[PDB]
Design a protein around this ligand. Structure first.
Ligand SMILES: [K+]
Ligand SMILES: [K+]
Ligand SMILES: [K+]
Ligand SMILES: [K+]
Ligand SMILES: [K+]
Ligand SMILES: [K+]
Ligand SMILES: [K+]
Ligand SMILES: [K+]
Ligand SMILES: [K+]
Ligand SMILES: [K+]
Ligand SMILES: [K+]
Ligand SMILES: [K+]
Ligand SMILES: [K+]
Ligand SMILES: [K+]
Ligand SMILES: [Mg+2]
Ligand SMILES: [Mg+2]
Length: 1320
DNA sequence: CAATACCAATCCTGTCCCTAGTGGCCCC
DNA sequence: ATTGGTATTG
């Protein structure tokens, strides 16, 4: 009675099977609970659990953070109103009331309906004088008269509520009055250097050219056009580009060896410019200085389109410009349409349904949709030239609140706000006293490193307070501990040392950590010369000399440097061979050289007395990102260095953390030697033990202390903390629960083996392509995100339109004639990603098809491939695989096959470890683990090839059985494999461990199933396959294949759709207009949706069976009812708080409490003739049955549809009649179970219509036909050209008298409840 | 109670931590 | 994308 378990783990399924030692699947009677006829039922021990995908937490986080922003924005407004309260009460005692109730209809308002002034005359006059808020803002900035306090409030509130971005540090003071003079000064500073070839700036309208509503590049070309004998990539062209906010590279201008890319807005610009000047000289400093100056005058030319000398509110003035031009152009456009085409006027100016001006102002038409609609009308008419110019510049009839306003920095709104306060504090003293408070309301932003301002009821918060009092924007620095909070921000996320779990890991860039890595790599180097009899380790003296002479003088140390600069120079070896390092050392002392460049004091860095200091410094530079806090924490060391060194130290930042703590690296000491780990790495006799040897050596104390330092998650908590998609982690937890249930089903006996198999954006594509092209091209100009989902076109755009194996251009319109080749051939590496694929004219040109692209191709194309790699168009892996010919060995191919068959993904190993640790808990007399259950892992290709070899074909579309069948085949193949070759356990069993030959072995490892094999030459194998030593039979080709065939043909498979309560958003999010419908849901308690609109379409968390009574007619007589009420996600807590009260408030009486059944989505019901339905909601049903199509039809559909061999084609043609039979099957299933008369008859007519089609296409569309009979939600499908739309089951009445089936996770344990016995 | 046809909030900036895959060193 | 909600048409 021994057995094994097969498992197929997916993101929406767990297939499972129990097999005996004869590869059979047992069947058992299981008790059936409930109130029906049936006491028990037969069940095969094979099935699959289906489930909806687990979701990431991202959408939840987006909602959460947006909620916090709405709360805090309301609070900004509340702070402002509180400052205004006393004096506003003297001016207008109900003003803020009128603002708060502005949303209410007149019936519900408690004050006069006109919010600003409370009477119609003043309200109309206000709007006449100030058509937009920006008119008022500009007036209050520029005017010197005392202003009404309510208008002052409205201006300040508009600025605070929509305050612009915080992407620019420091203060911003707009001034575009002398762009021409700054440009001339740049030209003068340039001509100062290049007297021989100066630029004549006379007549160049730089102000107009550089401030036009065009792209930065467009203006760059326009400007260079005006400078004769000057080219766009020249030095002055690059300086203009710099001033425009581009990123020019000054490498070619100065014949440099490295890149000199420069961007003014990058926070690294100062140090980059200092590096460049160190290369070329400080005489060029002024030049870039002048660039900065010009840049400061045109920085915001895009948003500030008005001269700054006329107004201190140029943003509001630019909005007013938008408004005025909109008005003038609207008058002109109306007149032109009235004249040249009157019949269209209405459609353009009245029809909200159309994308005219009506749809633009009143309908749902966007600015883009409106321009696309009206541009043909303009081109068709005469007198529309300037209108078309504005249209093509996205600047025609513009609104002021628009999608592109995100560019406005908060400093501009702050400038207008500060100016208004300065104007009006002369008249209202409270504005003088609170000016800085109001400014702070606008400017204050909670630092990202502080997080929510919680008080112990937020699982997201980490902020600590200095005093227990309410936090405001004004006391924030006094109440909140910014330092401790910024520390917690990082430390709550960083790892502890796995060896010393109470110690934090070191910063990745810690000097100590990098010393550790260098000495750890160095202590396993070995060397030989002529006079030496065997290879020798490096001694402590040698390693110290190597670190001092090489690692502390070069950032990277190459093997050639090791041989010449040390062995030759110091040891006088003319030749030496080195092992333990290839090409260059991996580790390096990067931080040592960074700090040397900064502080220019090698003796300070090499002085061990300073160790702690430097560690702390690096910790500070890793922990904190805010330069002010960096300065605060480094101030305690400012006495050791000067001002410029501290300036450079502040800008020196690191990110990243290591794997080990300082206490582990250089703290704990071996008791007898008194030496740290780093001490041993520096010098360990002639043993030269490295970190792994040191912490495992029983002759040292380290291992004992690690064990003393070591230290209870649940299964759910353990799985949740794994690295992996939430979708696959859901399947992992379900797999473990399935295994638990199956073990209970076998009387709590554990299996012999468990075999597990685990199955295997357009905006990102557009971003990659834009970045690569701008780093490179005008290919999007000549051939302008959805389209990028085409693979060959995607590869074309990623490759700059060139062949990758031949140095030639490729043609867009010829992509169908080209080839997509595997860089590493797919016969070795089953990688189908862009990282291993290439678009070439002909794959023949790769060279020989058995290896990496040939040496000739490498010699041809390595330079172009390096150019591609630099622009980040191919990865280092891709370039290395492309260029491997100059360096595929036989070991590579053997390993490629091995990895085709040996699973190495971390997540599958984690599933294997979970199962292995759950099954195997006992230890033997030697305290070794007792592995009662072997956990085998298989890659999909094994069972896939098994199916394709022995004609156990799968067609996923027929039904869901293929998951269960996959699990069964996994069990069979895995147990057979380790029975035949018991050595392979080392590769296939979790926890077990201690070129042409291995290639041949792993390539023919599965041949023992076959009777004849063709390698190549023919090989023949016996009928009965046995173990190499024990002699136990592992496979009988005369019986076991028939066993598999019988298992795969069994019609009763336990397919179970996991019932799930629905969670998440309450409803569709659209805020719909008002309507007479009880389906509208109020968005606020008192906002009756008949007056105000609201949501509809709530999601049902679960349905509820109610047996009760409802009042009928005017007399209100009671009438028994049985119906399904859907409890929405919003209603759920209220229903569960007290269900009888909830139901009675719904209009039910005398509800039978004990008969209330909670019915989550997918609840299973059986009706007549074995017909089954699943609950889709309280009002809709899904198909509940599986079509058990016989195996012969499945294999026919596979082979005929081309889902080669002659015997297969003869079988397809001899069994053509099968087509009809398959339709018959479908039909007899539908008429019994689907009950879609119209759709079925349309399908039958479509099949009789296309009988004269090729058999291949008829099978390819019969595959589509199974969407009619598939389990689950109805969906539309197509047979050839005819479309069958889904038939929906829009009533749930019939399941109220049907049989409810509660299923356990495997479906083996059932409780059946006849609902016809309830309420009659 | 029919089909049955339409509908579904969207973009964007910045700071940081973590694993894992790739294919190699060196180890338990 | 899918698929359950909704109004509409009957
Ligand atoms: K019974
Ligand atoms: K009223
Ligand atoms: K020129
Ligand atoms: K609109
Ligand atoms: K708007
Ligand atoms: K290396
Ligand atoms: K940092
Ligand atoms: K293993
Ligand atoms: K959930
Ligand atoms: K969900
Ligand atoms: K269940
Ligand atoms: K983000
Ligand atoms: K991220
Ligand atoms: K490794
Ligand atoms: Mg709220
Ligand atoms: Mg708005």
């Amino acid at each position: 009675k021994k057995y094994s378990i097969g498992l197929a783990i997916g993101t929406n399924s767990v297939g499972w099977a129990v097999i005996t030692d004869e590869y059979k699947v047992p069947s058992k009677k299981f008790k059936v609970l409930g109130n029906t006829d049936r006491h028990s039922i037969k069940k095969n021990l094979i099935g699959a659990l289906l489930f909806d995908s687990g979701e990431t937490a991202e959408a939840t986080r987006l909602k959460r953070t947006a909620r916090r922003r709405y709360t805090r924005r309301k609070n900004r407004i509340c702070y402002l109103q509180e400052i205004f309260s006393n004096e506003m009460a003297k001016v207008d005692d109900s003003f803020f009331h009128r603002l708060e109730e502005s949303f209410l209809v007149e019936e519900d308002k408690k004050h006069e309906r006109h919010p600003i002034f409370g009477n119609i005359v003043d309200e109309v006059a206000y709007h006449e004088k100030y058509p937009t808020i920006y008119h008022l803002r500009k007036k209050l900035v520029d005017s010197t008269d005392k202003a009404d306090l309510r208008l002052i409030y409205l201006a300040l509130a508009h600025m605070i509520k929509f305050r612009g971005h915080f992407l620019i540090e420091g203060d911003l003071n707009p001034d575009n009055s002398d762009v021409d003079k700054l440009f001339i000064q740049l030209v003068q500073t340039y001509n100062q250097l290049f007297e021989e070839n100066p630029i004549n700036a006379s007549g160049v309208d730089a102000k107009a050219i550089l401030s036009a509503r065009l792209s930065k590049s467009r203006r760059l070309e326009n400007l260079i056009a005006q400078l004769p004998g000057e080219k766009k990539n020249g030095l002055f062209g690059n300086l203009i580009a710099l001033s425009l906010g581009l990123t020019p590279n000054f490498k070619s201008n100065f014949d440099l060896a490295e890149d000199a890319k420069l961007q003014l807005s990058k926070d690294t610009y100062d140090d980059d410019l200092d590096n460049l000047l160190a290369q070329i000289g400080d005489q060029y400093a002024d030049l870039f200085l002048a660039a900065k100056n010009l840049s400061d005058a045109i920085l915001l030319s895009d948003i500030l389109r008005v001269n700054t000398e006329i107004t201190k509110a140029p943003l509001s003035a630019s909005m007013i410009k938008r408004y005025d031009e909109h008005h003038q152009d609207l008058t002109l456009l109306k007149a032109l349409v009235r004249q040249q085409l009157p019949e269209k006027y209405k459609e353009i100016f009245f029809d909200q349904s159309k994308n005219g001006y009506a749809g633009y102002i009143d309908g749902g038409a966007s600015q883009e949709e409106f321009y696309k609609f009206i541009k043909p009308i303009l081109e068709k008419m005469d007198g529309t030239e300037e209108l078309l110019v504005k249209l093509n510049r996205e600047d025609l009839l513009r609104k002021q609140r628009t999608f592109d306003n995100g560019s406005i920095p908060h400093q501009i709104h702050l400038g207008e706000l500060h100016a208004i306060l300065r104007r009006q504090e002369d008249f209202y003293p409270f504005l003088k006293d609170n000016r800085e408070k109001i400014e702070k309301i606008l400017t204050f932003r909670i630092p990202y490193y502080v997080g929510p301002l919680a008080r112990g009821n937020s699982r997201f918060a980490w902020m600590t307070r200095k005093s227990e009092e309410t936090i405001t924007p004004w006391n924030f620095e006094e109440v909140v501990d910014k330092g401790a909070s910024a520390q917690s921000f990082i430390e709550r996320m960083t790892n502890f040392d796995k060896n010393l779990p109470n110690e934090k890991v070191l910063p990745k860039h810690s000097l100590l950590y990098e010393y550790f890595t260098v000495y750890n790599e160095l202590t396993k180097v070995k060397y030989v010369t002529e006079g030496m009899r065997k290879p020798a380790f490096l001694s402590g003296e040698q390693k110290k000399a190597i670190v001092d002479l090489l690692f502390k003088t070069n950032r990277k140390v190459t093997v050639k440097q090791l041989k010449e600069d040390y062995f030759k120079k110091i040891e006088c070896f003319d030749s030496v061979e080195i092992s333990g390092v290839e090409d260059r050392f991996n580790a390096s002392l990067g931080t040592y050289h960074d700090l040397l460049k900064i502080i220019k004091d090698k003796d300070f860095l090499d002085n061990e007395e300073n160790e702690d200091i430097l560690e702390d410094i690096v910790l500070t530079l890793t922990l904190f990102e805010d330069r002010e806090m960096i300065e605060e924490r480094l101030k305690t060391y400012a006495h050791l260095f000067d001002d410029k060194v501290m300036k450079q130290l502040k800008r020196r930042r690191y990110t990243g953390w290591g794997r080990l703590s300082r206490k582990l690296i250089n703290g704990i000491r071996d008791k007898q030697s008194g030496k740290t780990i780093l001490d041993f790495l520096k010098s360990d006799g002639f043993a030269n033990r490295n970190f792994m040897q040191l912490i495992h050596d029983d002759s040292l104390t380290f291992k004992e202390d690690i064990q003393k330092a070591q230290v209870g998650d649940s299964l759910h908590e353990h799985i949740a903390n794994l690295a992996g998609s939430p979708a696959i982690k859901k399947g992992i937890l379900q797999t473990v629960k399935v295994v638990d249930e199956l073990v209970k089903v076998m009387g709590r006996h554990k299996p012999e083996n468990i075999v597990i198999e685990m199955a295997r954006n357009s905006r990102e594509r557009m971003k990659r392509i834009e970045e690569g092209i701008k780093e490179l091209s005008q290919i999007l100009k000549e051939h302008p995100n959805t389209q990028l989902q085409n693979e060959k076109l995607y590869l074309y755009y990623l490759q700059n339109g060139r062949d990758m194996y031949v140095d030639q251009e490729l043609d867009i319109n010829r992509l169908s004639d080209y080839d997509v080749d595997a860089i590493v051939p797919q016969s070795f590496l089953k990688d189908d990603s862009i990282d291993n694929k290439v678009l070439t004219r002909s794959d023949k040109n790769r060279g020989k098809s058995d290896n990496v692209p040939s040496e000739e191709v490498v010699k041809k194309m390595k330079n172009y491939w390096r150019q591609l790699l630099n622009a980040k168009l191919i990865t280092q892996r891709k370039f290395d695989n492309l260029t491997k010919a100059e360096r595929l060995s036989e070991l590579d191919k053997a390993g490629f096959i091995k990895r085709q068959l040996v699973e190495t993904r971390q997540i599958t190993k984690h599933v294997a470890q979970i199962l292995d640790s759950r099954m195997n808990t006992k230890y033997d007399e030697n305290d070794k683990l007792i592995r009662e259950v072997k956990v085998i892992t298989l890659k999909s290709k094994l069972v896939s090839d098994f199916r394709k070899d022995f004609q156990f074909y799968k067609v996923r579309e027929i039904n869901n059985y293929h998951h269960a069948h996959d699990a069964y085949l996994n069990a069979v193949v895995g147990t057979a494999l380790i029975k035949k070759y018991p050595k392979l356990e080392s590769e296939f069993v979790y926890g077990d461990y201690k070129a042409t030959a291995k290639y041949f072995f792993y390539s023919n490892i599965m041949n023992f199933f076959k009777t004849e094999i063709t390698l190549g030459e023919i090989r023949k194998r016996p009928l009965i396959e046995t173990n190499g030593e024990t002699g136990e039979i592992v496979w009988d080709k005369g019986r076991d294949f028939a066993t598999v065939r019988k298992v795969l043909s069994m019609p009763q498979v336990n397919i179970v759709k996991k019932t799930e309560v629905q969670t998440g958003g309450f409803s569709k999010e659209s805020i719909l207009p008002k309507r007479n419908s009880d389906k509208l849901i109020a968005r606020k308690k008192d906002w009756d949706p008949k007056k105000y609109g609201g949501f509809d379409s709530p999601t049902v968390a679960y349905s509820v069976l109610v047996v009760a009574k409802v009042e009928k007619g005017k007399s209100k007589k009671l009438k028994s009812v049985k119906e399904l009420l859907g409890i929405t996600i919003m209603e759920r807590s209220s229903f569960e708080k007290n269900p009888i009260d909830f139901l009675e408030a719904k209009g039910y009486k005398e509800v039978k409490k004990d008969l209330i059944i909670k019915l989550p989505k997918y609840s299973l019901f059986e009706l007549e003739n074995g017909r089954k339905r699943m609950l889709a909601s309280a009002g809709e049903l899904q198909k509940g049955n599986e079509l058990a199509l016989p195996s012969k039809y499945v294999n026919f559909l596979y082979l005929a549809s081309h889902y080669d061999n002659e015997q297969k084609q003869l079988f397809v043609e001899q069994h053509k009649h099968y087509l009809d039979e398959i339709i018959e099957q479908i039909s007899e299933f539908s008429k019994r179970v689907i009950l879609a008369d119209a759709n079925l008859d349309k399908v039958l007519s479509a099949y009789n219509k296309h009988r004269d089609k090729p058999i291949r296409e008829q099978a390819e569309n019969i595959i589509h036909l199974f969407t009619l009979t598939n389990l689950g939600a109805p969906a539309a499908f197509k047979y050839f050209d005819t479309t069958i739309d889904r038939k929906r089951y829009t009533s749930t009445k019939e399941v109220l008298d049907a049989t409810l089936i509660h299923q356990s996770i495997t479906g083996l344990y059932e409780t059946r409840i006849d609902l016809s016995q309830l309420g009659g």
